[PDB]
Design a protein around this ligand. Structure first.
Ligand SMILES: O=C(O)[C@](F)(OC(F)(F)C(F)(F)C(F)(F)F)C(F)(F)F
Ligand SMILES: O=C(O)[C@](F)(OC(F)(F)C(F)(F)C(F)(F)F)C(F)(F)F
Ligand SMILES: CCCCCCCCCCCCCC(=O)O
Ligand SMILES: CCCCCCCCCCCCCC(=O)O
Ligand SMILES: CCCCCCCCCCCCCC(=O)O
Ligand SMILES: CCCCCCCCCCCCCC(=O)O
Ligand SMILES: [Br-]
Length: 581
């Protein structure tokens, strides 16, 4: 096509084009005001319309990379505001585009966004909806400059739907606030997930990424042949490498080309792609990544024929070790969508270690005859953990389950800050809430999706502020051994009980006026501090103190005089608690 800008406008549509141009500029000019960005979008949009009317109009034949760079270099305050970045304007393309990619700021030093009152939000949405939504699209994009632009737009459309339905309801807040809390949690997870994959591609390697992909794609597309899975995996690895380099237009085109191939080869891939493949180009790649797993071929044979019995195991392996191990992973994963990818990789590393030892031993066939038995323990450990934890959750409920986790983790690593302990424990209790609702066959995959991001954030915080070598060890082990390591941590036998401090256990009536959330965190912060002072306390002993405290609040929160109840009846609860322990 002669005009890329015209081709994108016609393909995306005016509304979507204007929103993506706003996000693109906001992620590079993170310190320019919203009104400045609106003017840029309108200037690029009117030029695009000139090219849609006549593709041979001036500058309509230029690259979108050249047009983006030219506009960035027209900003008059560029040097004074961004310094080094302005020096990219002295370079020619393609060196200027690479220079801009290298000078984007990951940490904008900006104040946190404060959720306004519902009525203020709903009044703003009504009087000027586009302004309200684009202002917040700008605020988020400047704060998250590496978040894939098309996905941020998909979240904005979700936010629009929440405000449209809730701002005209009877209890707006009861409708909207639970939705904004869900969208925020989903957005933070996607950001962390996007950055984690790129950091993994560099730390663990391309071979490692490809094993992960073979396993996941064989679970989603079980009827596809190994060679189609191997093709999609080779292509998916190229898209991830480009996307992780940072260029949005290059990432979007690679992703779209792969979507086009998948949709032109559905009969050779999956029966669940019909609707994703009818959707517009902007949403096709996203839809495919969320597609449900296809049913597997009804009768599939045992894996022992080709992987244990056949006399040609060591021969087929030596011919191409990674192809053979990939075929094993493909065959095991297609049959086990109920497993985590990391479990399937543990089973693959066990077969590889076994073949490496037995294929060079006096008698190989006998040496590896019982390999499938080495897989049973690896499968039951994660399976039992899921059942045990999902059972304890059902008997307790989210908050109490979170509190059961709090005591467990505080005793395992008591050096961790009380705030870090409370958040991690609350987050993990949420994974259990959501995943334990899914059925047994989707629980382990659910847990992996969320634990991957919960644990890496924990390991990121620990790198910055290290406190335990045992956490460092688990955080610096093979990613296949990360969760098993954390789960194997035992109660710290070396920790010295923290010294008592009355204030930490001093409570006021301000608690009765707090939200459920703020009140839960206050109590949980105190439970952490209790276990830190009395780490040898038994579950019978702690339940007693917790039962006594609970009875204290309800009472002093119901007493004609409260400020005194909390003070007097609180000096007794503490002294009796100290004695029981
Ligand atoms: O396979 C793993 O090791 C895994 F990471 O954890 C786990 F199995 F889900 C688990 F063990 F944490 C539990 F408790 F949730 F089962 C997951 F999530 F990848 F499966
Ligand atoms: O695996 C564990 O021991 C772990 F505690 O997670 C967990 F137990 F699986 C869980 F409780 F978070 C749940 F809900 F997923 F089951 C942790 F911290 F190691 F990941
Ligand atoms: C990501 C695109 C968002 C555009 C619309 C956002 C509207 C919600 C504003 C209030 C949310 C503030 C952040 C929060 O939920 O804590
Ligand atoms: C695309 C087909 C072959 C490419 C990838 C197959 C590699 C086999 C993985 C065996 C090692 C698993 C452990 C790991 O890398 O994390
Ligand atoms: C000059 C500003 C250019 C901004 C245009 C950005 C276009 C990105 C949208 C590409 C469509 C998404 C493709 C995909 O992810 O499958
Ligand atoms: C060493 C003296 C400790 C003071 C006693 C108060 C400790 C209770 C804090 C945790 C309460 C648990 C909350 C709950 O069960 O709902
Ligand atoms: Br910490």
């Amino acid at each position: 096509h002669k005009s890329e800008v015209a081709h994108r406008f016609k393909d995306l549509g005016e509304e979507n084009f204007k929103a993506l141009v706003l996000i693109a500029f906001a992620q590079y000019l993170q310190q320019c005001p919203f009104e400045d960005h609106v003017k840029l979008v309108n200037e690029v949009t009117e030029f695009a319309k000139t090219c849609v009317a006549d593709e041979s109009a001036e500058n309509c034949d230029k690259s979108l990379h050249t047009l983006f760079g030219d506009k960035l270099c027209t900003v008059a305050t560029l040097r004074e505001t961004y310094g080094e970045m302005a020096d990219c304007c002295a370079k020619q393309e393609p060196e200027r585009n690479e220079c801009f990619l290298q000078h984007k700021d990951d940490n904008p030093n900006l104040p946190r966004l404060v959720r306004p009152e519902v009525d203020v939000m709903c009044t703003a949405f009504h009087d000027n909806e586009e302004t309200f939504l684009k202002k917040y699209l700008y605020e988020i994009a400047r704060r998250h400059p590496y978040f894939y632009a098309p996905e941020l737009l998909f979240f904005a459309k979700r936010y629009k739907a929440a405000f449209t339905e809730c701002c005209q309801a009877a209890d707006k807040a009861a409708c909207l606030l639970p939705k904004l809390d869900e969208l925020r949690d989903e957005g933070k997870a996607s950001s962390a997930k996007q950055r984690l994959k790129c950091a993994s591609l560099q730390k663990f390697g391309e071979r490692a990424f490809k094993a992960w992909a073979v396993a996941r794609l064989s679970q989603r597309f079980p009827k596809a042949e190994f060679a189609e899975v191997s093709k999609l995996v080779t292509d998916l690895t190229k898209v991830h490498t480009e996307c992780c380099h940072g260029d949005l237009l290059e990432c979007a085109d690679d992703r779209a080309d792969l979507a086009k191939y998948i949709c032109e080869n559905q009969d050779s891939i999956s029966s669940k792609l019909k609707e994703c493949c009818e959707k517009p180009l902007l949403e096709k790649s996203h839809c495919i990544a969320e597609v449900e797993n296809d049913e597997m071929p009804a009768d599939l044979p045992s894996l022992a024929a080709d992987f244990v019995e056949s006399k040609d195991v060591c021969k087929n392996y030596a011919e191409a070790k990674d192809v053979f191990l990939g075929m094993f992973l493909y065959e095991y994963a297609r049959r086990h969508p109920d497993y985590s990818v990391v479990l399937l990789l543990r089973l693959a590393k066990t077969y590889e270690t076994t073949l490496e030892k037995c294929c060079a031993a006096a008698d190989p066939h006998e040496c590896y005859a019982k390999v499938f038995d080495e897989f049973k323990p690896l499968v039951e450990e994660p399976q039992n953990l899921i059942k045990q934890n999902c059972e304890l959750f059902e008997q307790l409920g989210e908050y109490k389950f979170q509190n059961a986790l709090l005591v467990r983790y505080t005793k395992k690593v008591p050096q961790v800050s009380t705030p870090t302990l409370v958040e991690v424990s609350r987050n993990l209790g949420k994974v259990g809430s959501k995943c334990c609702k899914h059925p047994e066959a989707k629980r382990m995959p659910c847990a992996e999706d969320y634990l991957s991001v919960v644990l890496n954030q924990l390991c990121v915080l620990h790198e910055k502020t290290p406190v335990s070598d045992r956490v460092t060890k688990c955080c610096t082990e093979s990613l296949v051994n990360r969760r098993p390591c954390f789960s194997a941590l035992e109660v710290d036998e070396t920790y010295v009980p923290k010294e008592f401090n009355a204030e930490t256990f001093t409570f006021h009536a301000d608690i009765c006026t707090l939200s459920e959330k703020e009140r839960q965190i206050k109590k949980q912060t105190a439970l952490v501090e209790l276990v830190k002072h009395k780490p040898k306390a038994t579950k019978e002993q702690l339940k007693a103190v917790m039962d006594d405290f609970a009875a204290f609040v309800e009472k002093c929160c119901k007493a004609d005089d409260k400020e005194t109840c909390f003070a007097e009846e609180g000096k007794k609860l503490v002294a009796a608690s100290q004695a029981a322990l």
